[PDB]
Design an enzyme around this catalytic site. Structure first.
Site, PDB file in Angstrom:
ATOM      1  N   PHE A  78       6.696  -9.476   1.986  1.00 44.71           N
ATOM      2  CA  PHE A  78       6.413  -8.391   0.696  1.00 44.71           C
ATOM      3  C   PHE A  78       7.443  -7.251   0.704  1.00 44.71           C
ATOM      4  CE2 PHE A  78       3.098  -5.309  -1.040  1.00 44.71           C
ATOM      5  CZ  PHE A  78       3.751  -5.246  -2.032  1.00 44.71           C
ATOM      6  N   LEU A 127       6.005  -5.272  -9.898  1.00 45.37           N
ATOM      7  CA  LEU A 127       6.472  -3.848  -9.813  1.00 45.37           C
ATOM      8  C   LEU A 127       7.351  -3.158 -10.807  1.00 45.37           C
ATOM      9  CD1 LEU A 127       6.968  -3.873  -5.823  1.00 45.37           C
ATOM     10  CD2 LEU A 127       4.867  -3.402  -7.316  1.00 45.37           C
ATOM     11  N   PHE A 151      10.858   1.807  -0.385  1.00 46.17           N
ATOM     12  CA  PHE A 151      10.674   0.326   0.265  1.00 46.17           C
ATOM     13  C   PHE A 151      11.875  -0.502  -0.034  1.00 46.17           C
ATOM     14  CE2 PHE A 151       9.328  -2.256  -3.506  1.00 46.17           C
ATOM     15  CZ  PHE A 151       9.052  -1.292  -4.409  1.00 46.17           C
ATOM     16  N   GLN A 185       8.292  -0.361   3.984  1.00 44.30           N
ATOM     17  CA  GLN A 185       8.178   0.821   3.394  1.00 44.30           C
ATOM     18  C   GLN A 185       8.699   2.040   4.230  1.00 44.30           C
ATOM     19  OE1 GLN A 185       5.386   1.759   0.129  1.00 44.30           O
ATOM     20  NE2 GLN A 185       5.229   4.012   0.537  1.00 44.30           N
ATOM     21  N   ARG A 229       4.779   1.275   7.162  1.00 45.55           N
ATOM     22  CA  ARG A 229       4.181   0.257   6.288  1.00 45.55           C
ATOM     23  C   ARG A 229       5.279  -1.138   6.167  1.00 45.55           C
ATOM     24  NH1 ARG A 229      -0.370  -0.417   3.547  1.00 45.55           N
ATOM     25  NH2 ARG A 229      -0.494  -2.005   1.719  1.00 45.55           N
ATOM     26  N   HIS A 233       7.995   1.023 -10.332  1.00 46.87           N
ATOM     27  CA  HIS A 233       8.940   1.587  -9.514  1.00 46.87           C
ATOM     28  C   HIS A 233      10.160   1.837  -9.877  1.00 46.87           C
ATOM     29  CE1 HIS A 233       5.257   1.672  -6.686  1.00 46.87           C
ATOM     30  NE2 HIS A 233       4.994   0.771  -7.673  1.00 46.87           N
ATOM     31  N   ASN A 284       5.923   5.571  -5.024  1.00 46.41           N
ATOM     32  CA  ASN A 284       5.414   6.904  -5.817  1.00 46.41           C
ATOM     33  C   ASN A 284       3.963   6.748  -5.913  1.00 46.41           C
ATOM     34  OD1 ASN A 284       4.250   4.885  -8.025  1.00 46.41           O
ATOM     35  ND2 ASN A 284       6.463   5.042  -8.475  1.00 46.41           N
TER      36      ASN A 284
END
EC number: 5.2.1.8
Length: 164
Positions: free
Chosen positions: A59, A121, A112, A62, A54, A125, A101
């Site tokens: 951004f 985030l 990521f 991942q 991903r 995370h 997660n």
């Protein structure tokens, strides 16, 4: 004293380059040790051969799902998903390494790499490392992602391990 690990990245099987990370064992030892051990393979399983499934340009990238290769799998070195160690470190810009997660206290092996500042985030995370060398390789990886995260070429950790 903080460990350094590297990924050797490939794109449709062709070498792209090496990304190295400093792991913040002084601040998040359990989370850093999980990623370090998965990167050496010393428990018999880990990141070698796995993919970045991903990637969203601007951004994050991942990866770490070495059991199902699509975001539904992966496992920690602890025999179970483990707790959020702390949220001391924040998502302050490109290069931050952070745990993926499925909600509070569900860390496994997925992680990521941020390619921007992602402050929303923070507190969700666990940040546990940062790119040390090879941010340009992450930027080249990013260009094979897409708006919905599907990659246009297969991005793989061809090799990985611990540097000294």
């Amino acid at each position: 004293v903080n460990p350094t690990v590297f990924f050797d990245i490939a794109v449709d099987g062709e070498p792209l380059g090496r990304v190295s990370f400093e792991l913040f064992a002084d601040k998040v030892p359990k989370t850093a040790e999980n990623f370090r051990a998965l990167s050496t393979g010393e428990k018999g399983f880990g990141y070698k051969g796995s993919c970045f499934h991903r990637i969203i340009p601007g951004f994050m990238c991942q990866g770490g799902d070495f059991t199902r290769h699509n975001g539904t799998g992966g496992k920690s070195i602890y025999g179970e998903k483990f707790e959020d160690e702390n949220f001391i470190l924040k998502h302050t810009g490109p290069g931050i390494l952070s745990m993926a997660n499925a909600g509070p206290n569900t860390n496994g092996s997925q992680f990521f790499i941020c390619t921007a500042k992602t402050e929303w985030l923070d507190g969700k995370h666990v940040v546990f490392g940062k790119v040390k060398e090879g941010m340009n390789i992450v930027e080249a990886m990013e260009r094979f992602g897409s708006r919905n995260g599907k990659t246009s070429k297969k991005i793989t950790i061809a090799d990985c391990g611990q540097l000294e």
